[PDB]
Design a protein around this nucleic acid. Structure first.
Ligand code: K
Ligand code: K
Ligand code: K
Ligand code: K
Ligand code: K
Ligand code: K
Ligand code: K
Ligand code: K
Ligand code: K
Ligand code: K
Ligand code: K
Ligand code: K
Ligand code: K
Ligand code: K
Ligand code: K
Ligand code: K
Ligand code: K
Ligand code: K
Ligand code: K
Ligand code: K
Ligand code: K
Ligand code: K
Ligand code: K
Ligand code: K
Ligand code: K
Ligand code: K
Ligand code: K
Ligand code: K
Ligand code: MG
Ligand code: MG
Ligand code: MG
Ligand code: MG
Ligand code: MG
Ligand code: MG
Ligand code: MG
Ligand code: MG
Ligand code: MG
Ligand code: MG
Ligand code: MG
Ligand code: MG
Ligand code: MG
Ligand code: MG
Ligand code: MG
Ligand code: MG
Ligand code: MG
Ligand code: MG
Ligand code: MG
Ligand code: MG
Ligand code: MG
Ligand code: MG
Ligand code: MG
Ligand code: MG
Ligand code: MG
Ligand code: MG
Ligand code: MG
Ligand code: MG
Ligand code: MG
Ligand code: MG
Ligand code: MG
Ligand code: MG
Ligand code: MG
Ligand code: MG
Ligand code: MG
Ligand code: MG
Lengths: 46, 38, 77
RNA sequence: ACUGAACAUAUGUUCUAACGUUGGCCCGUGAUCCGGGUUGCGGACAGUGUCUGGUGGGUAGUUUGACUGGGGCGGUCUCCU
RNA sequence: CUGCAACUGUUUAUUAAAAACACAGCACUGUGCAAACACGAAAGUGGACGUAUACGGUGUGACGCCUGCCCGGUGCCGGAA
RNA sequence: UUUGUAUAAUGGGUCAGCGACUUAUAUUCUGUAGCAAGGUUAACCGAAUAGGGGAGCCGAAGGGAAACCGAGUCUUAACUGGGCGUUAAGUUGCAGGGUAUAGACCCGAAACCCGGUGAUCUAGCCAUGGGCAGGUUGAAGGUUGGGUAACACUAACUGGAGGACCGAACCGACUAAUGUUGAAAAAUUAGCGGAUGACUUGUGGCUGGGGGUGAAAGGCCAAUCAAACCGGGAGAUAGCU
RNA sequence: ACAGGGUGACAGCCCCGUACACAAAAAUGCACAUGCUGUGAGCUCGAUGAGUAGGGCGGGACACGUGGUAUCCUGUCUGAA
RNA sequence: UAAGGUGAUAUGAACCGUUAUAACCGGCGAUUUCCGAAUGGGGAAACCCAGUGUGUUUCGACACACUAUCAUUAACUGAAUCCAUAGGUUAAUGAGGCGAACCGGGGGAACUGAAACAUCUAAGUACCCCGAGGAAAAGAAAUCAACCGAGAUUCCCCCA
């Protein structure tokens, strides 16, 4: 059966990547929260 | 609005006369035309 | 924005109040109009977005005096 | 309120100068935006603000009793003998 | 032999595929264009680079024969002394 | 937990560890200690757990709505009256019981609101690419002959229409059995429907939560939908267990 | 100097410290002293904040829910001395 | 400051040093790839693609430096349109991003309490947004008081 996760790296980067996050103030707030928490990986960006 | 006429205006008065006109008359016609001043 | 360039009047919030005193939030907007003002000194029309109140101020103080205040505050026209 | 002028007898007609233009042409300009200009057409109307009557399950917050030989329906709910 | 739906389609991913939805066709109604209408405090955008033989809403549901009476109620339309 | 449980009512497989009446401030009462018609200081000052600081607070007088009067006072025109008072114990710590405000003994909703994250599943749409073995049927149109005043009409051939037919791929999902701690959180096997279309599919794009999208089932929006998910208001509230 | 830590057990005198007394080439904070540049104090004579105060309408903030309701703020319409 | 040492894992390898350029510690410097406000353009962060000017060249090529936007100011230029203005170009200066709390301002819930609930409460709280500083804000009476007087603001204890 077709499951929900159907990977596309292009779509992943466009939806959730670093530049997508930086594009909006709410995205920048995501990065600030993740830096504050001290995540090793800020985004899906490879 | 009190204005000083700089020209003969009909049903109003002659040069150098103080007269009370509606603000729109002054603002939009008399003053910009140069027929009166405040 | 709905802001008077002469007076700085802008939307303020308040309540509607029913007979039963139910409060619902509302805004009060300024009575704004775009108006072409004859600037005798500069031999031209200037357009300002002004409240009716601002127009009474301009009548009283004169456009030249008002335009000076705009230039001081750094508001273009 | 922004919103003015004549004229006739609050009402109408006319006017242009506010205001509108999702008409045309010119310029910024390599631009179906925007602004300015010129001109036409509307024109104190339209439209917007504040106030105000109406309408308003379109939307929202809520309410919609208790007793009871289960609950509902019916009856009852205070006072007097 | 017979009910239902004209028909091909669509639907409750994971208990319902149907007589439900849609449908061509029909009718009523709104809409003169900056259209009605819709998204949007707005600017705008869709409707449409369309213009009443068009567009939106509503109901009915191929086709055949047809579609009676009631305007009191509720709505809508019109009148205004 | 109950009127009542060996109950066939509840809970516990067992062990170990953890797991529920607290804290702050105010207030009242009891005990106890100090001082006593008085008791005590707060902030602050002070290196000072000292000392200063008496601003205040409580008490030693009540009555009356109040002015006001005062061991009385109020009521009344006035009391033989009647109500409330009058006979010195209070106050500040410390410990405790209760109350108040706070999550207030602990655990537990369904929900409500705010800000974000999601259309890699799915719904619709947009752009750009791809797919549909094989076999049938034989619309319009045309040609020729017949036929007509000319049409009309008519036979054969040609032609190749269609949400046309049969049927694989592909897309679906009607029946049955199996499976149901599965091979699988929706499948397998045998049959079944559509299969040139209102078809199907790849890649990318757009629509966002009272919002989308919906040939409409309240369907679908990441195995979640009569209001998604994540975080927050937040220890919501729980007259219930 | 009995702060504390370490050392083959729980060390004043084994070690590192501790009390106490000293220390800066360089950069730098702070407090005073003093060059320089800018600065106008003081005195005299004036001036004395208008679409403002106040008001009507609608709201809001003041402990104060518009109430008999002062005062404050102002979206709207006005408007002094 | 020193007889040891080159950070640890970590063992050894090659070494450095012992009276002062071993090492270690402190002051001041130098170097400081790429991404990131990211600023030469673009972009699926850590990559792709340039322009201009200086040089250098073994003619294969190479190095270095500039090149964002916006605001302000100045200069020059410059439409419709005669002046002008809009616009354009260059230069100088500044800004942007990040940050736990505290602070000022713009917006602003609901659960909840009221033993239901609508006024009211929760609460101008949570939250969103803008701005700022080492603190912020407030502040020098068109203030109170009560016929006596006080003398800006802020904070604490009372009043209660
Ligand atoms: K015009
Ligand atoms: K009008
Ligand atoms: K309604
Ligand atoms: K009974
Ligand atoms: K019974
Ligand atoms: K049948
Ligand atoms: K039928
Ligand atoms: K079916
Ligand atoms: K259906
Ligand atoms: K009727
Ligand atoms: K009727
Ligand atoms: K029981
Ligand atoms: K049971
Ligand atoms: K107590
Ligand atoms: K006591
Ligand atoms: K008595
Ligand atoms: K005592
Ligand atoms: K308690
Ligand atoms: K796709
Ligand atoms: K929702
Ligand atoms: K999910
Ligand atoms: K021992
Ligand atoms: K020791
Ligand atoms: K006023
Ligand atoms: K960069
Ligand atoms: K509420
Ligand atoms: K309650
Ligand atoms: K309720
Ligand atoms: Mg409702
Ligand atoms: Mg509620
Ligand atoms: Mg009952
Ligand atoms: Mg039958
Ligand atoms: Mg059917
Ligand atoms: Mg079918
Ligand atoms: Mg199903
Ligand atoms: Mg089925
Ligand atoms: Mg039907
Ligand atoms: Mg029982
Ligand atoms: Mg027994
Ligand atoms: Mg048993
Ligand atoms: Mg049992
Ligand atoms: Mg039970
Ligand atoms: Mg059990
Ligand atoms: Mg007394
Ligand atoms: Mg077919
Ligand atoms: Mg399906
Ligand atoms: Mg099968
Ligand atoms: Mg078939
Ligand atoms: Mg249903
Ligand atoms: Mg799902
Ligand atoms: Mg809901
Ligand atoms: Mg709360
Ligand atoms: Mg809870
Ligand atoms: Mg031992
Ligand atoms: Mg006043
Ligand atoms: Mg006022
Ligand atoms: Mg007043
Ligand atoms: Mg008022
Ligand atoms: Mg860039
Ligand atoms: Mg760059
Ligand atoms: Mg490029
Ligand atoms: Mg309640
Ligand atoms: Mg700073
Ligand atoms: Mg300050």
């Amino acid at each position: 059966m077709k499951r929900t996760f159907q990977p596309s790296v292009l779509k992943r980067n466009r939806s959730h990547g670093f530049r997508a996050r930086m594009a909006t103030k709410n995205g920048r707030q995501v990065l600030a929260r993740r830096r504050a928490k001290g995540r090793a990986r800020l985004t899906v960006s490879k | 609005m009190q204005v000083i006429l700089l020209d003969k205006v009909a049903n109003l008065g002659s040069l150098g006369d103080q007269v009370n006109v509606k603000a729109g008359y002054a603002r939009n016609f008399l003053v910009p035309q140069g027929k009166a001043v405040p | 924005s709905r802001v008077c360039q002469v007076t700085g009047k802008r939307p303020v919030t308040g309540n509607n109040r029913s007979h039963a005193l139910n409060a619902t939030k509302r805004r009060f907007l300024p009575n704004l109009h775009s108006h072409r003002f004859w600037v005798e000194s500069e031999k031209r029309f200037v357009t300002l977005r002004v409240s009716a109140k601002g127009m009474r101020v301009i009548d009283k103080k004169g456009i030249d005096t008002v335009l000076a205040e705009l230039r001081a505050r750094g508001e273009k026209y």
